[PDB]
Amino acid sequence: SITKTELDGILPLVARGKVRDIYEVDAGTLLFVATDRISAYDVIMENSIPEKGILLTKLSEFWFKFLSNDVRNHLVDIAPGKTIFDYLPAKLSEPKYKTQLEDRSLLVHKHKLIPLEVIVRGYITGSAWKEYVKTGTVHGLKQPQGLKESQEFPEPIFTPSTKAEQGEHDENISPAQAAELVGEDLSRRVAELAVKLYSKCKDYAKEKGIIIADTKFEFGIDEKTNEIILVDEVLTPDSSRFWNGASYKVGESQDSYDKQFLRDWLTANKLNGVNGVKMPQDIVDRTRAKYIEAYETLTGSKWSH
Ligand SMILES: *OP(=O)(O)OC[C@H]1O[C@@H](n2cnc3c(N)ncnc32)[C@H](O)[C@@H]1O
Ligand SMILES: Nc1ncnc2c1ncn2[C@@H]1O[C@H](COP(=O)(O)O)[C@@H](O)[C@H]1O
Numbered sequence: 001s002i003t004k005t006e007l008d009g010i011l012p013l014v015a016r017g018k019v020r021d022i023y024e025v026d027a028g029t030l031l032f033v034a035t036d037r038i039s040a041y042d043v044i045m046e047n048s049i050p051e052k053g054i055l056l057t058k059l060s061e062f063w064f065k066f067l068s069n070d071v072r073n074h075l076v077d078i079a080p081g082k083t084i085f086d087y088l089p090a091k092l093s094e095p096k097y098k099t100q101l102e103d104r105s106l107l108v109h110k111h112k113l114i115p116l117e118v119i120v121r122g123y124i125t126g127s128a129w130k131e132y133v134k135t136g137t138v139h140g141l142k143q144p145q146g147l148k149e150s151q152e153f154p155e156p157i158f159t160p161s162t163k164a165e166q167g168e169h170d171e172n173i174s175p176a177q178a179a180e181l182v183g184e185d186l187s188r189r190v191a192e193l194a195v196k197l198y199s200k201c202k203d204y205a206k207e208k209g210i211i212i213a214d215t216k217f218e219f220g221i222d223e224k225t226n227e228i229i230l231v232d233e234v235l236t237p238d239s240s241r242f243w244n245g246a247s248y249k250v251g252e253s254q255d256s257y258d259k260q261f262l263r264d265w266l267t268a269n270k271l272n273g274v275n276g277v278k279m280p281q282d283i284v285d286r287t288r289a290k291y292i293e294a295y296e297t298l299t300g301s302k303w304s305h
């Protein structure tokens, strides 16, 4: 279990997010290390979910491979017979550093980001449901009358939000606003590509028993070639709303696939939003089992006995 990486200056730390520790390898190259930290209600838990970061990294690698014909991604192309350790300072191969990084790290090319959170929704829930009940719209887009809670949209919809610089929160915008923001032609290409990727993964996951209700993509742009690049993490339970397909019912709220046990435990104790909370062991074990189940389900691989 890894909560926080400590590489002792061997690589420059760029930032610790909720879940990832980010290191700079060179001017053009970052190392993303997924830790075993978990958040709920915008707060990180004190203890970790063991191997959560390995599972999510392996899941992300799976999706990048699944989509390799559909879009370029930011992964560094590691040469046959080499590992990420051959691209890093030799000292990171010592067991004390190696164990913090192995199986949970992605070596990626730094790119200029398209300044949008590219959210695509296949089912109406969360903020989209709230807005719809009130106004009959989602990001100003007119919706059909009579949608029920958690119902599939007729087609997946592109519902971008701004990507706010530190110090402020992300605003929901309409596709026309995204066009003013990033350019008409670019915004159309983004929408086309995001809907294409989401639909493909949504259909695949549904056959495996998981409903991906919505997901957040982030895209970079190669300004030489004009190509859009998939960056960040892709289609994990931290970046997407995963629902259990077997229990899925229109006209109801759905349980969080991964975080329901944790959420119920916190709300029952009124600990939501409270700092320094330690999850009880049975909460840890139950939550860990879900990450493993998501992994085995989507990937077809067994984790262990
Ligand atoms: O999830 P997070 O808040 O830790 O992400 C850190 C920041 O890094 C950006 N990101 C993701 N992928 C890239 C690439 N390849 N190049 C440059 N920045 C990248 C995320 O947008 C987030 O702001
Ligand atoms: N950029 C990278 N960062 C971390 N791991 C990688 C990266 N590229 C490939 N891998 C992993 O290295 C192994 C070799 O697979 P591959 O090179 O895609 O045939 C797989 O487990 C990959 O997921």
Ligand SMILES: [Mg+2]
Binding pocket: 237, 238, 258
């Ligand atoms: Mg999660």
